[PDB]
């Protein structure tokens, strides 16, 4: 498992991009062969996306052959609604870049049937083999998507019912009302996201700290999600300052060692 | 993981019979795809083989095409020996059931080659392909069946020397005399165990609260086999309320919420 | 997992040695179906090697059909220099027995193209299939062969910049001086080492304790990677006397127990 | 240490006032001899406030020869302030009492020599002897008052420089502005508490879990100065539900069963 | 503190009942100076009574200036009933050895008023001015005599109402059934036995092993109380084999080295 | 507790001086009325002597009315032996001060009596009073002076065995040979370091990372000497960055902040 320490968010974010870019690059997509990238929405890949959508512009990347997968979507919430993951997504990073509509995999919150809507999507990823590449936060008790903690490290994309904690934390965006945010929202399971060939969690602030800490320094254990990703074959968590808190000052001083090469341009 | 926390051992029995019969039910097992079932003897499942026996005398379930494969059997022992784990077995459930003769597997104590015994036992596993829902209980140390603590992940039906604790634990069978106990007993794997698709143990009494403990709430560690499971797909634990004095009070409020609506009926 | 509680690195030594003969002696390896073998360098090994000779010696085991691969090897260091782990390997172990040069694999630290020759070297071994018994020791970090902690579980075969601990600790064998010993070295991987069919793992001197404790008492982390051995299928510690300092009473007393039978003629 | 596990703010409120009434009447306070009483300010002892003016009210005491000496103050802040500690004590307590006003002890938040209003009020209490009952909150990092983590277990009253969280914290009372909130304030030390003969805290919501598990189960240590408790000969700690989600079930069930006779007519 | 690692009970009788000799013989006590022993009754002082005996008989002791403190007694239980602890002090020790009956005190469990009996109880010890030696055994959560865990460390004599655990674990002696065994006991508090001079603590049996370990090895805290003697100027904890289960290598290997001298004759 | 957090052995002891310097300055001492200063000697203190004089060199300081005490001395060791302490503190401090031969008290390693030695040390100390400052450095497991760890919080001066871990420790003064150094030395105990009235320890060094850990963050514990400094009413570590490794980020973040004002100059 890798850990980036870096110090600010707008390190974090270009340092995310550099890495997916790099990794699609190499790996020289084609329509027959295209990159499957994972992605997740909210205020934690703000500045990852602001970094990618430069580089592209840049004419550094082209998203043309890169087929994308997002991990989550509110349940019965109008596409067009501004605050749906859908609008997210465009408005933040595809309208700004060359990918396909075809190219683009996103959980419909108003499928008619909802199981057949995850079962499919499930499909559609095996369609194209594996995401080669799967980004994702972590919540505050390490939880991934919208997977519980305890949940199985099996589970797959499926309904879920949103927790107040949720409701509340995502309140702001709807005026800063509750009772506005969606009950249920469609998410990835754990499964899902750890058949990904490489997995690359971002963790922005002190209010990550415990759950970096029982990533890097505690033990496997599935209470805490995000440890499990120590039995993942190419797992890397990126973080900034504030999220350190929790961590052994000889643990940030052997990632900052062994990866002071990795860490500039940022 | 799933955690059930009920009241009384009755209602642990009612929670985990109901279980099996709307697993079999969904299954809709067949004579050429029967449903295959692990299960255990003692004390622990005793509330769940009197509310199996009521639901299939009510007209719920037949066992006409359920394959059962039991964990463990004591060497030596004349299968009519009231104490065998055969006897138990056919007292407690097959004598009320519709099961076929063969469609039942015990470990035979006195078989003439005993390694010969648990290599077929594990043939005749596969042969069926699969164990779709197997049913413990679990020792104070935490292990499995006959199972020592530090076993392998990857262990298989085999001979096992039994240790005076169960010998003494085991003697009031036995009149209360421990030297009449058995010294040997056959015992599938942890690793038999594992492959099965669905794991659901029953946790029943407070000197079990340490072994519940090690498994919801501690880490991955093989001196604690109960908490192994942490990483299998499908693994349910069901306990009373005796066996969580060693959860913290948020633990077992969080299962409490996330499970009330899978516990009324009992 | 089996810890072999001895008391003296002799004994260690012989109790391995012991382990590896039988487990090639059952096996019954011919030209076509070799027994597979991996090893290390170092004090660690010194009492098993010896042990290996005189049971070859006393006409108890032929490595006519065995093949053997080396953990690491120092990168650009001529095999001819006293100190290469080439040398130390015929010095020896090869020097004294009946292997053929075809049957013995060691990385080369002098190969044109370094990549290449770590990806060989795994092509290698997954010609023979796999490697039926790999010895190796760990370092007072838990560490394995030249892998840093928190390597991935499934790492291979690679370059690695060495540690100053390492260099300094190595130091002793080029005169005592520092700037002799490499920088860089080869080394196979955790994910190579997993893949072995059984894993023995050599413990001796209480500068080890913490990494003793790590692997038999301590939780599954990917900080000791000692530890993940708890997930392995067939794995042994073999441990002298000081190296227990850090256990349980009651640890040491319980393995004491269960393998008794195991460790007398040493 | 006692610990008081109740269900609601009010109940401990109840609980506490009447706890402070049976010492009063117990004591049986004169003119000469007067029961000095420690007293905290904030939401915390709201309840407690309410209903020991009922009592009073109900004719159950008299203040009349009870002297007070309060926790802290606010820095440079008229007393006529509405958010002052000053006029917090009169509007919540003491203009509903027969307190005399000589009974009255409070920090100057406007000394002109801040060291010696410090200074004096510790002179103060010693005069009386020592204060009988010190009633107080507790922080959710555990501190006392506005003494800092690992504070001395022999500090004594003085000024302290205000920390953001606070400031925050506090805000709110301040229109909701941070600049608006002092940024000094003068507090009693960890030493004036414990040399209280009875201690008792409140502990209301799940902020404060943590602080009461570090009290209740923890071991001593400078960090949660709240566990230094344990050393007291005579502490009590009164809690709601909401405070008790990190104690173990059977530490809950300890003190239930220990307190039960003296948990009702609340 | 001193931990004294023996083998056996009958060794751990031979080491207090010499210690406790060597302690009197060097003070010289006289009938204006007497030397005041704190003893406890049940099994685990048993072999330390038998060893006192016989030093004694054979001429090595005299407890002629010896005034005796009990920790315990009954409450409601006729003084002459054999399971009184007055019984079993007569009859295991007081028998046998010179000592004046003015010299011996034991809580009277018939006293009329039981509040003046435990006061008057402390005031006799006070009169002596201080007890010299304590010794007494440890319950299995590390609790001292009939003193609750979390009790404070200044807590004097008082009654105590007895737990099902203790009944049921005292019933043997009364018959074998529980409602025979008294509801209400006597103890000394733990401020009484910390104020003796010194205190030594008989620890034997794997029962035992938990409490053993919290007191050597564990932090101080109020829920094991034995772990407070840690801050006592002199305290000794003098236990068998069976007890250290616990225990690290190291600890156990600490302590043999430190009092190697100290324990040979036994 | 105080924790100053500095980075180099050189600020240490500029830090640690001038602390000295402003409490004696502070103190104003006179011939009747002396301040007392417990010392150490070793490479620790080095930079906080040359520190001390050159600011009595600068004019700062006068120790013509300071009275010091050392912590231990060699037994049996001439003091003009060049290793001796005696020799130490001449020719590292009291050579380059004024101050009077009948203010400095060392122990006598050859003494005719040595108990009588130790007693009249600790009579000597009470004599003045008290220690107004005790300077010490900690040992890698946290004990302090030569007192072994789990001795007694009122251990006195006494003479003590050295420990093998200590002579070699201590070879290299003496040739590089281990029969060299003494077998024996004299030493301050616990309880007379805990009479003093501030305690200031200087952590340097990477090797002594645990047991600072153990005395800001652990818990109290007999087993680490250092940690009982919690309870100390006025203690003080003062460390270089090497001694923080095993610190959690935000505690050495919160000491740095709280002794922001205090670290400049050095």
Redesign the interface.
Known sequence: ???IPLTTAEQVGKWAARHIVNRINAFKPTADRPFVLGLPTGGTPMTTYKALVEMHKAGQVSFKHVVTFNMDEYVGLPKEHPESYYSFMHRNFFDHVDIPAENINLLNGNAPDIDAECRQYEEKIRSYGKIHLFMGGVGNDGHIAFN???S???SRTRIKTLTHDTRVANSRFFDNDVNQVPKYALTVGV?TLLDAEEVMILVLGSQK?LALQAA????????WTISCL??????IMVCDEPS???????T????NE?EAENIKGL
Not at 216 to 223: K, L, S
Not at 244 to 250: A, D, G, P, R, Y
Not at 252 to 255: A, N
């Open positions: 498992m890798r850990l519980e903690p305890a199985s490290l099996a499964g700290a890097v320094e505690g033990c496997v254990n599935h209470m120590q039995l993942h074959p190419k797992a350190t808190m929790e961590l052994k000052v000889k940030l001083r052997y990632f062994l």
